């Protein structure tokens, strides 16, 4: 409706008999391609991402944001837990960290 | 030419153009945004299309209602069989209903 691509902003400019919106919009640019996951199985527990997903670059899980890469550490705070791993299609085995544990030892 | 209104209307000059896009074209036009909508989603329709499996595009749709992705990946089988009885249930109507 406001341009190609995700709307950002507009601004309008008058023009003879009508009007000229500039639209601006974000474009993802230059995708690179990643194994994915729907879930992570954890101490028999089920993992879904809170707000991202799982990616592996080949060796290691990350949960990023959608739209733009940025891998961090799957851990308590970036997921959520819900049910066993026997259910969902495609669930991979993988460590989510807990924050606390390390305070706890320390 | 007697059994025919076109043949009349022709004769006394109204005549039909064709469409510049043929029935085919428009088929490969909707077989593209098929393949694109089920392949990698909404993402083409912004820019490059980015491949993402089916089943995780349907729990980003799920979020966007505010179900939470969990319900869409633990009712997997049943939502893919709601869908299939759905769409049977449409080329039913449609073989079947007159107009
Ligand atoms: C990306 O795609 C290439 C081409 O098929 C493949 O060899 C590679 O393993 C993929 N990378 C990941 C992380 O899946
Ligand atoms: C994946 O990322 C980790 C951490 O960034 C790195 O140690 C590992 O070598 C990477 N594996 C690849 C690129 O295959
Ligand atoms: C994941 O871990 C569980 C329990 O340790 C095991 O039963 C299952 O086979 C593992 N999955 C894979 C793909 O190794």
Known sequence: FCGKGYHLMSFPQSAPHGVVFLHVTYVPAQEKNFTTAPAICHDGKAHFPREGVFVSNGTHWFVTQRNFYEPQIITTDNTFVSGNCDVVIGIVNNTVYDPLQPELDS | ?99
Do not use: H
């Open chain 2, 1 to 99: 030419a007697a059994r025919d209104l076109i043949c009349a209307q022709k004769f006394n000059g109204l005549t039909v153009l064709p469409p510049l896009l043929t029935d085919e074209m428009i088929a490969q036009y909707t077989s593209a945004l098929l393949a694109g909508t089920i392949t990698s989603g909404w993402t083409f329709g912004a820019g490059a299309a980015l491949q993402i499996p089916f089943a995780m595009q349907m729990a980003y749709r799920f979020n966007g209602i505010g179900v939470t992705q969990n319900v869409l990946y633990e009712n997997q089988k049943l939502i893919a069989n709601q869908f299939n009885s759905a769409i049977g249930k449409i080329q039913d109507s449609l073989s079947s209903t007159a107009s």
